[PDB]
Design a binder for this molecule. Structure first.
Ligand code: CQF
Length: 108
């Protein structure tokens, strides 16, 4: 749909070089074992990341823009849930979510 094209545009922007300084932690699933975060999957029931959103978009998994937005917001919420509020990754999440929310609000 036209709204899903707008969502795909947002996704492309979130993955683009101009946001890479703060978007990079969200590019791929959290590899909890690689990071020593042995409680991550006890705390985060539904992991999400931009590569998974992209795969879902490419596979036409999303019914509508609302479903896409719920996944992007789940990704940020997982970050806010797991990490202390003063962690660098939380500051990066807030900045990337600001990009997302302002452009999602421009949906046709
Ligand atoms: C998102 C998110 N939500 N919870 C976490 N993550 C996260 C995802 C990926 C990476 C990572 C590390 N390497 N690669 C290639 C990816 C690091 C983190 C966080 N760690 C972190 C993040 C940013 C900075 Cl500046 C310092 C530490 C802790 C776990």
């Amino acid at each position: 749909s036209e709204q899903l094209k707008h969502c795909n545009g947002i996704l492309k922007e979130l993955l683009s070089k101009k946001h890479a300084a703060y978007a990079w932690p969200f590019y791929k699933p959290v590899d909890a074992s690689a990071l020593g975060l042995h409680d991550y999957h006890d705390i985060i029931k539904h992991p999400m990341d931009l590569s998974t959103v992209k795969r879902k978009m490419e596979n036409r998994d999303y019914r509508d823009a609302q479903e896409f937005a719920a996944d992007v917001r789940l990704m940020f919420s997982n970050c806010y849930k797991y990490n202390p509020p003063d962690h660098d990754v939380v500051a990066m999440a807030r900045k990337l979510q600001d990009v997302f929310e302002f452009r999602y609000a421009k949906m046709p």
